[PDB]
Amino acid sequence: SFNQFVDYTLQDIICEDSTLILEQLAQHTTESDNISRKYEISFGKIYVTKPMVNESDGVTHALYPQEARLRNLTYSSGLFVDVKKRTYEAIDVPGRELKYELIAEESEGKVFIGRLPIMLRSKNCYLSEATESDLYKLKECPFDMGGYFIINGSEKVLIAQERSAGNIVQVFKKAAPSPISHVAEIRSALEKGSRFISTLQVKLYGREGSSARTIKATLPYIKQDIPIVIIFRALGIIPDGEILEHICYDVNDWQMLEMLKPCVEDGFVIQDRETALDFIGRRGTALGIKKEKRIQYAKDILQKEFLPHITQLEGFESRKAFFLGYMINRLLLCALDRKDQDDRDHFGKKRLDLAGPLLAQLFKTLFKKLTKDIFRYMQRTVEEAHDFNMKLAINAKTITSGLKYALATGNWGERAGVSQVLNRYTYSSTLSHLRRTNTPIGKLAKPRQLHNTHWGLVCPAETPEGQACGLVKNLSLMSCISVGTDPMPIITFLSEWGMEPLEDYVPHQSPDATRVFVNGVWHGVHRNPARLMETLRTLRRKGDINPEVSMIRDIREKELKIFTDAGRVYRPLFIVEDDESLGHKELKVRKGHIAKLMATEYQDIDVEEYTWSSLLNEGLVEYIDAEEEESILIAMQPEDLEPAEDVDPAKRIRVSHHATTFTHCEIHPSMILGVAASIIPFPDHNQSPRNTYQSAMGKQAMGVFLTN
Amino acid sequence: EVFDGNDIENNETKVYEESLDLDLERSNRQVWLVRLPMFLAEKWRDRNNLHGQELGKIRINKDGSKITLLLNENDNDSIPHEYDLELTKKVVENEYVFTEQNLKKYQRDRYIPYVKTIPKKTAIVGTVCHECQVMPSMNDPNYHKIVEQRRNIVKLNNKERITTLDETVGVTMSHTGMSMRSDNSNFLKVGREKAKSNIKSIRMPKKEILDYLFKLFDEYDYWSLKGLKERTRQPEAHLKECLDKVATLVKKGPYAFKYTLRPEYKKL
Amino acid sequence: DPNEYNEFPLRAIPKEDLENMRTHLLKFQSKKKINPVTDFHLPVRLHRKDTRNLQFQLTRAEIVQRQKEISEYKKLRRKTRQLKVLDENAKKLRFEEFYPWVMEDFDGYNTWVGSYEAGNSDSYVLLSVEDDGSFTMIPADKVYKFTARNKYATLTIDEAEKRMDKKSGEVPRWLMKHLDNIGTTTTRYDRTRRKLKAVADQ
Amino acid sequence: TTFRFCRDCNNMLYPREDKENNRLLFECRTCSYVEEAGSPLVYRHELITNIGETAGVVQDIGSDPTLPRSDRECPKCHSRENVFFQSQQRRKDTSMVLFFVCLSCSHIFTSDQKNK
Amino acid sequence: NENFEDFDVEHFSDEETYEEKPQF
Ligand SMILES: [Zn+2]
Ligand SMILES: [Zn+2]
């Protein structure tokens, strides 16, 4: 996560608010001063130094973590960005449109913007390239794994923060006293933009015994809950048949149409797109719009604020309308009891914010504040006619103190307990702390209980016994968190392999079409999803698609979901193929691959290096998260459950499951445990609270935490 | 071309030589709506290409309505030259192709004669009946090139990593904060361009300055201190010492804070 | 190869007849087939006008009728500000598509307002069949969905905001059938027909 | 119920009386399109639902690996191999009758004995 | 300070539970 944040996310944050334009009006009392000046400061490429420290007397030298721990320094490195100053001027002729030109003062020029704390053993740290003898020379323990920050000489670990996944439609049954029976909400969030969270709630009024059960949705920046038909007509879908086609995908599902009948009756008197937009414009919360501009205000709200995770550009009203219809369809499916309400505790519906995303959002806030200060100083200099000093414009202490304060104290802002002092009682205690996850807690769910989806991702018995029981979780041994990839290549690939776009999709002519979702965004439909899923799986198993990408085919409700976002917890699994030579399902990994692995391992203690990525690229293993785990069948043991079927009475009773359609096999079942639970001898012979007590108490033992 | 609509003055006869009505006689041309892959759409939509040259041949075999493209060899050799045109819609309804062209601007019952209409020369180029997609043939020798290209679409990374400065860390801080290096840039040097100007005004005598003030008051009755001073190039103390004697300032009117001629001298 | 089929050559359009002319795509959203050469009261008028406050913009028939009748009658400021930088292409689309395409016939029988569709306007290539069987290739740039407006006498917002009020009870099932029976808030076509038959009586 | 829509404006039709024949005609509230009603039923409200229990059955339902397999008797193919699932309609009080899908003919045959 | 995982119950400290339900 830290390497992703340093290598890619920093430039993305810089390029999001790169250009800072200041326009100076002529303010001309006489026509002799009819010139308007346009000053632009633009941030370019960002540079990072090796970790280093500047002392009192101004000398800057390389800082190593041993010195930074001893001298109570911060193991940080400098950030430098390229700034090009643009000066545009134009003749201020009233009525005539201004055409600016450069005065050739395009000065450019690395400028120091702050110190980013460097997590140890990351790509920027000195200890990444260090050998064992180099680590001994630097008085660093070779057993030390890194993974932490040094802030003021304290080893700070960033606890992974668990949050609900974004861009997922979740339908919730409200309480009996509430007039709203069901609520379908989506926490619509975007990654390549302002990172603002806009929640669209589609709500179904009236209880089951009631008759006037209408559906009203909570658009952002709107004081009232607009009926869904008015929103559909405001999106350009006037007739009732097209609206019901967008919502109900089966013409024979008359019960869904019967529940939609009060909704179309409610917004019956609005029959035009402009009337619907002006109706939305009446309820605008800004309250500064004149009589005639409410149409454009409603269009602007529907474009830049209504479901921003799909698009922010114009001309995408059809996709937003189809997604709104999909939300209403899911809401009515739960309302008709065809599907249960969404499980809040499903671990596939969760994301874990590691050091990467946490430092990313913190640096986004700090850099927005820094750009605001740059513009404020620049406006002061151009208004009060003082000379512009480049060094006073960028206050590097802003970014430096923000990162240092949010890492030294756990308060993630300007959420507590994000950064904790790293445990150093034993080695296993440090390992357990570096894989610890935290779930902030006031909802109606049950997050403290161990869920089914927690299999192989978090430890079944490793949690504190106090008030943090179940809220604080520890990763299993093989579990990994995805760092996130760009969904644009996958979306481009899908549209060139038969995915019909959502603009020219009609559900009644394509009743068997499978909806295609990429990162929670409905991008279109596919007529033949089976061979598409086969193509996608063959690309991922050969490494063409990044192995962290999770692709889920839900055959029952005809959905193909692809997730490329960060924060997904996955685990490796063996691949079980058809294997027509043996006539039965078998693991793709064979004894030759195992021999290559042991040959590489014993060479490390001259043949080709056969690494874990060699298994990953040859399709022998695969990365499965909790969403994809819902659509696969896993065998616990290869040699016991793959081949088709006197027993030792001392052995435990095993079931063969009487089913040979396996798609995956567990690598080893002992890998469902975390660091502290893997110390326990025979944990399967113990009562589970005793395993939890030992996992808590293994961190309080005495050993040799580090050799240095 | 900004223009005003709802014109009951028949101004379109005088401001538009071309007729504003839609031309409809080309609407019977048959148009096939064809969807292209990335490489072919890249080489068929760029404006520097497409000089009327032949791009291939179309073979339509009536046995199974199989429509094939037979591209010429002049463009490339990595791309295929036989493409299977699949018809996703044999009959397409209510889809037309219309053009947009700039005009010749040179030479209840309630109505408002202003609707803000932007008129443009428009014409139906043709009618769409066949929605097509272009898939390369499976048996083409260059089809594996397309498979490799589509695999390379998701394989390569368009973003490079952050650049790490490899020089000594103090050399990078030679320019930062504490620095002997003064800024040689001329960016936002408002003080440099403002302190270089010096307006210096001699004490040329009383009769000549009052004659000049009377000439300027004959030119315009109301004068500001800055405007009169830049018109006469005189110090503010001496200019005020003449202006209080020969004129007066307005404190309350619409022309307040302006020195205007005394009403004894206003009639002269 | 045997000539048992037809072999039609394909050529691109010249670029001399591409400059300062854009070939968009027109798409009517209607269940029934719409043919502007037959179903439309000629002359037609496809302009880029304001769609705000329809049912109150008189059609070209009444415009020329009013033209005939009026011819017969005659015969401290803020020095600096922050500019939010934005991409030029989306600004050009917002400025161009601020007013939608509006296609009206002569009597206003068919008034279609076109909405810009940004989905797959860049992957579309038009193949225009020539008279000699040849194919000319035209790159499509924009796709517009056209929806019919005021075909059934829609009603304004003031009555609508009256109707969403819960002070009014159940909205009657045939309220605007009854309103058309009364003669309030009719279509543009009916209003133009009324004015034309009133003028024709003199 | 078989909801009907207008063939001119694609808005939904509503029932209306007439007196010259005393029959059932569905009326378009938008553009007054009228046709005969094919059935006198205008509104049905089911309190017990039997649709949606066999939902999701597709041409490749057998490609799902998570679905259990059985050796039961298909009474259209006499094929032993088939997949099965419970009632997909997720009401809390539905029965646990199994729905079997033959992978050779895609017939939906159940394990119910009250119906059979 | 201290950092111990052995959970010691804070006695006489029901005010956390009193403040959880301040209205009836
Ligand atoms: Zn109708
Ligand atoms: Zn069968």
For every residue of chain C, DSSP letters joined together read ---SSEEEEEEEPPSTTTTTEEEEEEEEE-SS---TTTSS-SSPEEEE---TTTTSSPPHHHHHHHHHHHHHHH----SEEEE----HHHHHHHHHTTSPEEEE-SSSS-EEEEEEE-SSSSSEEEEEE-TTS-EEEEE---EEEEEEESSS----HHHHHHHTSTTS-SPPTTHHHHHHHHT-S--HHHHHHHHHHHHHH-
A87-111 residues labelled b (16+ CB within 10 A) or e (exposed): bbbbebeeeeeeebeeeebebeebb
CA distance A54 to A90: 44
State CA A689 to chain mean position distance: 33
- Three-state DSSP state, A670: helix
Least Cα distance to D100 among D91, D108, D92 occurs for D108
- Three-state DSSP state, A188: strand
Which amino acid does the sequence have at E8?
Answer: D
For every residue of A530-586, DSSP letters joined together read HHHHHHHHHHHHTTSS-TT-EEEEETTTTEEEEE--TT-EEEEEEEEE--TTTTS-E
A213-231 residues labelled b (16+ CB within 10 A) or e (exposed): bbbbbbbbbbeebbbbbbb
- Three-state DSSP state, A406: helix
Q: Do residues A12 and A369 lie in contact, with contact meaning Cβ atoms separated by under 8 Å?
A: no
Measured CA to CA in angstroms, residue A546 lies from A250, A616, A680, B38 at distances of 36, 10, 35, 22
CA distance A364 to A351: 19
Chain A contact for D96, CB < 8 A? no
Least CB-CB distance to B163: which of A47, A61, A544? A47
* CATH of the structural domain A484-565, one choice from 3.90.1070.20, 3.40.50.1370, 3.40.30.10, 3.40.50.80: 3.90.1070.20
- Between chains, do D60 and A268 touch, taking CB under 8 Å as contact? no
The alpha carbon of A643 and the centre of ligand 2 are apart by a number of angstroms equal to: 28
Number of C-beta neighbours around residue A75 at 10 A: 30
34-63 of A, contacting C, C-beta below 8 A: 38, 40
Q: Do residues B259 and B240 lie in contact, with contact meaning Cβ atoms separated by under 8 Å?
A: no
CA distance A162 to D115: 49
Contacts of C51 (CB under 8 A, 6+ apart): A274, C99, C100, C102, C113, C149
Q: Do residues A321 and A192 lie in contact, with contact meaning Cβ atoms separated by under 8 Å?
A: no
Least Cα distance to A542 among A628, A620, A627 occurs for A620
Chains that touch A (3 or more CB pairs under 8 A): B, C, D, E
Side-chain-side CA neighbours of residue A505 (13 Å): 29
CA distance between the termini of chain C: 73
CA distance C98 to C52: 11
Q: Do residues D65 and D83 lie in contact, with contact meaning Cβ atoms separated by under 8 Å?
A: no
For every residue of E1-24, DSSP letters joined together read -----S----TT-THHHHHHS---
- Three-state DSSP state, A268: coil
List the Cα angle A6/A8/A9 in 5-degree steps: 75
- Most A CBs within 10 Å: which of D1, D8, D9, D12, as the mutation test of the A interface? D12
For every residue of D39-98, DSSP letters joined together read -S------SS--SSTTTT--TTGGG-SSS-EE----TTT----EEEE--SS--TT-----
Joined together, the tokens standing for residue C137 give 């290739």
Cα radius of gyration rounded to whole Å, chain B: 38
Strand partners, A707: none
CA distance A687 to A155: 35
Q: Is D9 annotated as a binding residue?
A: yes
State CA A419 to chain mean position distance: 20
Specify burial of residue B214 (Cβ count, 10 A radius: 0-12, 13-18, 19+). middle
Q: Do residues A569 and A473 lie in contact, with contact meaning Cβ atoms separated by under 8 Å?
A: no
Specify burial of residue A681 (Cβ count, 10 A radius: 0-12, 13-18, 19+). exposed
Q: Do residues A486 and A454 lie in contact, with contact meaning Cβ atoms separated by under 8 Å?
A: no
Least Cα distance to A353 among A9, A702, A699 occurs for A9
- Three-state DSSP state, A39: strand
E/B touch flag: 3 or more CB pairs below 8 Å:
no
CA distance A407 to A387: 36
Q: Is D102 annotated as a binding residue?
A: yes
Domains by residue range for chain D, with CATH:
1-45 (2.20.25.10), 46-116 (2.20.25.10)
> Which position has the token pair 């008197």?
A269
For every residue of A223-236, DSSP letters joined together read SS-EEHHHHHHHTT
Chains that touch E (3 or more CB pairs under 8 A): A
CA distance A45 to C37: 57
State CA D77 to chain mean position distance: 24
List the Cα angle A480/A481/A483 in 5-degree steps: 130
- Most C CBs within 10 Å: which of D11, D18, D31, as the mutation test of the C interface? D31
Joined together, the tokens standing for residue C140 give 């499509």
Q: How many CB pairs under 8 A join B and C?
A: 199
Strand partners, A507: none
Say what the resolution is, in angstroms: 3.6
State CA C78 to chain mean position distance: 41
Measured CA to CA in angstroms, residue B21 lies from C42, C44, C46 at distances of 9, 6, 8
The alpha carbon of A530 and the centre of ligand 2 are apart by a number of angstroms equal to: 22
* Structure solved via: cryo-EM
Least Cα distance to B201 among B236, B244, B242, B247 occurs for B236
Q: How many CB pairs under 8 A join A and E?
A: 14
- Between chains, do A271 and C149 touch, taking CB under 8 Å as contact? no
CA distance A347 to A457: 9
Contacts of D93 (CB under 8 A, 6+ apart): none
Side-chain-side CA neighbours of residue B262 (13 Å): 10
Q: For A67, left (φ over 0), alpha (ψ -120 to 50), or beta? A: alpha
Q: Do residues D62 and A312 lie in contact, with contact meaning Cβ atoms separated by under 8 Å?
A: no
Domain at A167-343, CATH class:
alpha beta
The alpha carbon of C192 and the centre of ligand 1 are apart by a number of angstroms equal to: 21
Q: If you measure CA to CA, which chain A residue comes closest to B190?
A: A385
- Three-state DSSP state, B120: coil
- Between chains, do A338 and D89 touch, taking CB under 8 Å as contact? yes
Q: What are phi and psi of C129, to 5 degrees?
A: -75, 125
Joined together, the tokens standing for residue B189 give 């040097």
CA distance A78 to A49: 5
Q: If you measure CA to CA, which chain D residue comes closest to C149?
A: D9
Per-residue HEC secondary structure of A292-331 comes to: CCHHHHHHHHHHHCCCCCCCCCCCCHHHHHHHHHHHHHHH
> Which position has the token pair 């949705």?
A217
CA distance A357 to A363: 10
The greatest distance separating any two alpha carbons of chain D, rounded to the nearest whole angstrom, comes to 62
Q: Is D31 annotated as a binding residue?
A: yes
Specify burial of residue C84 (Cβ count, 10 A radius: 0-12, 13-18, 19+). exposed
Q: What are phi and psi of D108, to 5 degrees?
A: -95, 100
> Which of chain B's residues have a Cβ under 8 Å away from the Cβ of C25?
33, 95-98, 128
Q: Do residues A113 and A10 lie in contact, with contact meaning Cβ atoms separated by under 8 Å?
A: no
Q: Do residues A453 and A431 lie in contact, with contact meaning Cβ atoms separated by under 8 Å?
A: no
> Which of chain A's residues have a Cβ under 8 Å away from the Cβ of C160?
269-270, 275, 279
> Which of chain C's residues have a Cβ under 8 Å away from the Cβ of D17?
none
- Most C CBs within 10 Å: which of D9, D17, D43, as the mutation test of the C interface? D9
Q: Is D54 annotated as a binding residue?
A: no
Q: How many CB pairs under 8 A join A and C?
A: 107
List the Cα angle A547/A551/A553 in 5-degree steps: 155
CA distance A676 to A694: 8
> Which of chain E's residues have a Cβ under 8 Å away from the Cβ of A423?
3
Q: Which helix (H) or strand (E) holds B145?
A: helix B143-155
Helices within A342-471 (DSSP H only): 355-383, 390-393, 396-408, 427-434
Which amino acid does the sequence have at A73?
Answer: L
> Which of chain C's residues have a Cβ under 8 Å away from the Cβ of A296?
98
- Between chains, do A270 and C156 touch, taking CB under 8 Å as contact? no
The alpha carbon of D66 and the centre of ligand 2 are apart by a number of angstroms equal to: 20
Contacts of A124 (CB under 8 A, 6+ apart): A6, A48, A50, A51, A77, A118, B164
Which amino acid does the sequence have at C80?
Answer: T
Establish whether the linkage from the previous residue to C43 is cis, with ω within 30° of 0. yes
Chains that touch D (3 or more CB pairs under 8 A): A, C
CA distance between the termini of chain B: 53
- Between chains, do B55 and C137 touch, taking CB under 8 Å as contact? yes
